[PDB]
C-alpha cells in the first residue's frame, strides 16, 4: 500500500512548490502554523493540489483541527489503506 516515506516525500514536494521551504526541513513532529508558518489559504492550496495529483477528499470541517504533519499522514493512510 502506502508507506510513511512516500507520503512524506509527496507532501514535502508540495510544500516546496507552494511556500518554497526546502523538503529536507519537514518532519511529522513539526507544526504547520506555529513552526512551518503556513496560513489557512496555504492549507486550502495544499488540499487542492493533493486532491488533483493523487486524490484525497479532505473537507474543511475536520481540516480545521488538522495541525501537524503526523496527523495528516495518519488521516491519509487511514483513508487510503482502509478502502471503503
Amino acid at each position: 500500500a502506502a508507506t510513511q516515506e512516500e507520503i512524506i516525500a509527496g507532501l514535502a514536494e508540495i510544500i516546496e512548490e507552494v511556500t518554497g521551504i526546502e523538503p529536507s526541513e519537514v518532519t511529522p513532529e513539526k507544526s504547520f502554523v506555529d513552526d512551518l508558518d503556513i496560513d489557512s489559504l496555504s492549507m486550502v492550496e495544499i488540499a487542492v493540489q493533493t486532491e488533483d495529483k493523487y486524490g484525497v477528499k479532505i473537507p474543511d470541517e475536520d481540516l480545521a483541527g488538522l495541525r501537524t504533519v503526523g496527523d495528516v499522514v495518519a488521516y491519509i493512510q487511514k483513508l487510503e489503506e482502509e478502502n471503503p
Binding site: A9, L41, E45, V48, D52, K53, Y54, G55
Partner: protein
C-alpha cells in the same frame, strides 16, 4: 528545430531596424505634418441630405444670396449712444466688405435704412448687428478661411474711440474649436509622455528599461502618425480634431501596453533559470497570437463604428483602424528585434525584483474554494452602478463647453449684455407660390400667416414685410422681403429664452404645422414651405443619433465574438468574455453620470457614449482573452490547479497594464475641450472598474463553477488519471 518565424526575426534584426528607421524618416520628411493635413481636409458637420441644408440652399438660390449655409454676425458695441461718426465708420466698413467678392457672398443692410432703423437698434440704443453670408459649408476649410479673412478685414481699420467690434456665429465658434483642439493636442502629448515616464520608472525601478520602452513607443507613434498623414495627403480620407486626438492617445497607450506585455513575459520566463534564447522563444510563442488578436479586435471595432450616418463617426472610423493596424504591425516586427539586440549585450535587460507570486495564488485559492458568493457579489456591484439609469439627461449646445476667452464667446457675451440670446440665432421661413403677390388678397394672406405664426407659444418675435420691427420708401423693403420675380415670401423668427434647448427643437414641428394649417383654406394652397436655421440643423442630428448609436453598437459585438471564437476555438469562452464586459458597461456608465452631472453640475454632451462604448468593449475584451489564453496553457494538469497557476503567473502584468492605460486616458482633464475630458475620464473609471473587479473575480469564478463545460466543443478532463505515491 526552432519555429521559423522567430528564428528569421532574430537572424535579421539589424536590417529590420534599419528599414524601419529609413521608412519613418522618409514618411516624416516627404509629406507635411499631420496638423496641416487635418486643417486642409476638414469635413462639414451637417449631412448634405438633411432637409435643413437643402432648404437653406434653396433659400440662397431663389433670392440670389449665394449657396452656402454659413453665416456670420458683426456686432458694434459702445458705452454711449451711437453717433454720426459711428454711422460713417459703419458705412465705410460696409463698402470695404462689399469690395471683396471671393469670400463675402452677400450681406443685408438694415441699420442704414430709416424705415428699418429700429431693427438693429437696441432698447437703449447702445449696440448694433449686421449679418454677412460666407462661402462654403460650416466646418470645412472654406468657411474657416472666409471667417479669418472677414476678421482680418474688419481689424485692419482702427475703430472710433469708445466702441469696439466683435464677430459671432457658428463658423467662428467652429474655427476657435479647431484651434483649441490643436493646442490641446500639443499639451496632451506633453502630459501623456510625462505620465508614461513617471509610471514606468515607478513600476520597473530601472532607468535603462524605461528608456527602451520610450524608444519603442516613440518609434511606433512616429510611424503611425506619418502613415496617417501620408494617407490623408492624397485626398483619400477626411479628418477632424477628435480623430487626431483619439488616434494619437490610443496609439501611444496601445504601444505601451504591448511593450509591457512582451517584456513582462520575457522577465517572468527568464526568472526560472532559463537562458536568453529560451526566454525569447518562450515570450514569442506565448504572446504573438494574443497581441495579434487584440490588435485585430480593436481594428474591427473601429471599422464597425465606421458604419454610421453622422459625418463625425464616419470620419472617425477608417483612420483609427489604419493606425491600429500600423501600430500592431510595428510592435510585432520591432519589439523582438530590439529585445534580442539589447539582451545580447550582457546585462541590459536582466530582471531586478520579484513582484508577486504569493498573493495572487492565495486569491486564486479563495476563488476556487468559494466561487458562488464571489460571483453574486460581483454581479450585485455591477448592477448597483446601472441602477441610476433614469436620471440621464443630455445637452446640445457647444457654447458653454468651450473656454470663455475665445472671440466668439466674448461676442456672444457682448450681444447678450444688451440683447436677448435668441436674437443671435434667427430662423428663416419661406413660402413659395406660383404667381405674383401684388394684390391685396396676398398681403392679407401674409398678414393671416404672420398672425398664426405669432400665435404659437414660445416665439418671441416675428418679422415680415408688414411688420419690419416687431412709394420708394416702401419699395425698398420689397427688395429685401420678396423675390425679384415675385414668387415667394420669407419671414424671420426669433425665439424666447434659449433657442437651443429641447423646447426650441420641438417648436419647429409645431410652427411648421401652424404654417401648414394657415395655408389651408387660402388661394395659396399647395405652396412650398422651407425652414432654415441652427435648430433645424440640430433636429436632424437629434433624430439620427440614437439609430446611429444602435447600428454601430450591434455589429461590434458580433465581430468581437467572431474574432474571439477564431482565436480560442470555443463558443462558451467567447460568450462569457463578451457577456462580462456587456454587464460591466452599466457600472462605468453610472459612475460617469454620477461624477459629472450630479456633483460637477455639468451635463453630458451627446458625442460621448458613442465613442466611449466601442473603445471600452474593445480594450476590455483583451484582458479576458489573455487570461483565458494563459488558463488554456495551464489547464493541462487540472482545472483547480490550472486556475491557481494562471492567476499566480499572470496577475501583476495585467494590473500594471490596466493602471498604465487608465492613467494615460485620464490625462484628458488638462484639455480645454471638455468633451475630450469627459470621454477620457469615463474611459478611465470604466477601465479601473474592469481591471479591478471583472477581470479578477468574475471570469475565474465562472470558469471554476462551470468546469469542463467551459471548453465546449473540445473535450477535457478534470482529474487527470490519479497517480500512486512516489
Amino acid at each position: 528545430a526552432r519555429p521559423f518565424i522567430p528564428r528569421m526575426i532574430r537572424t535579421f534584426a539589424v536590417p529590420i531596424i534599419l528599414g524601419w528607421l529609413v521608412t519613418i524618416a522618409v514618411l516624416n520628411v516627404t509629406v507635411p505634418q499631420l496638423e496641416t493635413v487635418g486643417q486642409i481636409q476638414a469635413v462639414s458637420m451637417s449631412p448634405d441630405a438633411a432637409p435643413s441644408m437643402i432648404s437653406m440652399k434653396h433659400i440662397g438660390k431663389v433670392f440670389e444670396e449665394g449657396d452656402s449655409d454659413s453665416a456670420a454676425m458683426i456686432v458694434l458695441e459702445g458705452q454711449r449712444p451711437l453717433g454720426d461718426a459711428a454711422h460713417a465708420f459703419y458705412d465705410q466698413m460696409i463698402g470695404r466688405l462689399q469690395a471683396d467678392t471671393t469670400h463675402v457672398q452677400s450681406l443685408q443692410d438694415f441699420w442704414g435704412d430709416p424705415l428699418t432703423a429700429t431693427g438693429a437698434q437696441s432698447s437703449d440704443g447702445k449696440a448694433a448687428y449686421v449679418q454677412v453670408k460666407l462661402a462654403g459649408n460650416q466646418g470645412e476649410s472654406l468657411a474657416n478661411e472666409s471667417v479669418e479673412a472677414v476678421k482680418t478685414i474688419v481689424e485692419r481699420l482702427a475703430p472710433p474711440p469708445g466702441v469696439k467690434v466683435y464677430v459671432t456665429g457658428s463658423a467662428a465658434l467652429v474655427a476657435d474649436q479647431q484651434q483649441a483642439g490643436d493646442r490641446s493636442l500639443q499639451v496632451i502629448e506633453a502630459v501623456t509622455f510625462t505620465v508614461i515616464i513617471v509610471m514606468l520608472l515607478l513600476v520597473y525601478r530601472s532607468i535603462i528599461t524605461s528608456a527602451i520602452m520610450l524608444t519603442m513607443v516613440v518609434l511606433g507613434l512616429l510611424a503611425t502618425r506619418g502613415g496617417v498623414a501620408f494617407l490623408g495627403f492624397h485626398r483619400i480620407i477626411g479628418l477632424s480634431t477628435f480623430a487626431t486626438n483619439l488616434l494619437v492617445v490610443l496609439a501611444i497607450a496601445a504601444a505601451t501596453d504591448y511593450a509591457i506585455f512582451l517584456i513582462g513575459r520575457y522577465q517572468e520566463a527568464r526568472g526560472l533559470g532559463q537562458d536568453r534564447e529560451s526566454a525569447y522563444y518562450t515570450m514569442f510563442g506565448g504572446t504573438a497570437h494574443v497581441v495579434l488578436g487584440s490588435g485585430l479586435t480593436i481594428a474591427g471595432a473601429t471599422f464597425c463604428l465606421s458604419f454610421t450616418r453622422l459625418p463625425y463617426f464616419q470620419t472617425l472610423g477608417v483612420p483609427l483602424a489604419i493606425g491600429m493596424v500600423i501600430v500592431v504591425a510595428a510592435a510585432l516586427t520591432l519589439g523582438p528585434a530590439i529585445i534580442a539586440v539589447t539582451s545580447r549585450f550582457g546585462k541590459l535587460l536582466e530582471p531586478k525584483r520579484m513582484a508577486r507570486v504569493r498573493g495572487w495564488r492565495k486569491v486564486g485559492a479563495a476563488i476556487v474554494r468559494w466561487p458562488g458568493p464571489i460571483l453574486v457579489g460581483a454581479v450585485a456591484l455591477a448592477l448597483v452602478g446601472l441602477l441610476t439609469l433614469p436620471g440621464y439627461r443630455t445637452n446640445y449646445n457647444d457654447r458653454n463647453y468651450l473656454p470663455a476667452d475665445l472671440p466668439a464667446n466674448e461676442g456672444y457675451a457682448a450681444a447678450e449684455r444688451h440683447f436677448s440670446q435668441a436674437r443671435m440665432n434667427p430662423e428663416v421661413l419661406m413660402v413659395e407660390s406660383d404667381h405674383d403677390m401684388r394684390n391685396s388678397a396676398d398681403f392679407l394672406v401674409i398678414n393671416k400667416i404672420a398672425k398664426a405664426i405669432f400665435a404659437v407659444e414660445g416665439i418671441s418675435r416675428v418679422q415680415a414685410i408688414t411688420r419690419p420691427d416687431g412709394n420708394p420708401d416702401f419699395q425698398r423693403g420689397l427688395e429685401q422681403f420678396l423675390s425679384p420675380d415675385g414668387h415667394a415670401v420669407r419671414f424671420i423668427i426669433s425665439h424666447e429664452g434659449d433657442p437651443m434647448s429641447q423646447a426650441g427643437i420641438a417648436r419647429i414641428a409645431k410652427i411648421k404645422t401652424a404654417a401648414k394649417e394657415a395655408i389651408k383654406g387660402t388661394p395659396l394652397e399647395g405652396s412650398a414651405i422651407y425652414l432654415g436655421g441652427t435648430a433645424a440643423m440640430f433636429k436632424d442630428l437629434s433624430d439620427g443619433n440614437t439609430y446611429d448609436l444602435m447600428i454601430a453598437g450591434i455589429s461590434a459585438l458580433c465581430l468581437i465574438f467572431i474574432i474571439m471564437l477564431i482565436t480560442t476555438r470555443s463558443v462558451v469562452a467567447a460568450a462569457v468574455i463578451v457577456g462580462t464586459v456587456v454587464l460591466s458597461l452599466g457600472a462605468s456608465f453610472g459612475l460617469s453620470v454620477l461624477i459629472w452631472q450630479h456633483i460637477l453640475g455639468i451635463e453630458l454632451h451627446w458625442l460621448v457614449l458613442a465613442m466611449a462604448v466601442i473603445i471600452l468593449l474593445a480594450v476590455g475584451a483583451d484582458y479576458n482573452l489573455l487570461l483565458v489564453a494563459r488558463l488554456k496553457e495551464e489547464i493541462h494538469a487540472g482545472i483547480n490547479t490550472g486556475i491557481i497557476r494562471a492567476m499566480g503567473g499572470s496577475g501583476s502584468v495585467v494590473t500594471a497594464a490596466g493602471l498604465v492605460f487608465a492613467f494615460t486616458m485620464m490625462s484628458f482633464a488638462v484639455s480645454e475641450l471638455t468633451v475630450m475630458a469627459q470621454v477620457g475620464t469615463t474611459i478611465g473609471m470604466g477601465l479601473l472598474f474592469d481591471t479591478l473587479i471583472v477581470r479578477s473575480f468574475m471570469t475565474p469564478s465562472i470558469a471554476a463553477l462551470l468546469g469542463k463545460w467551459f471548453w465546449w466543443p473540445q473535450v477535457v478532463r478534470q482529474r487527470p488519471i490519479p497517480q500512486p505515491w512516489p
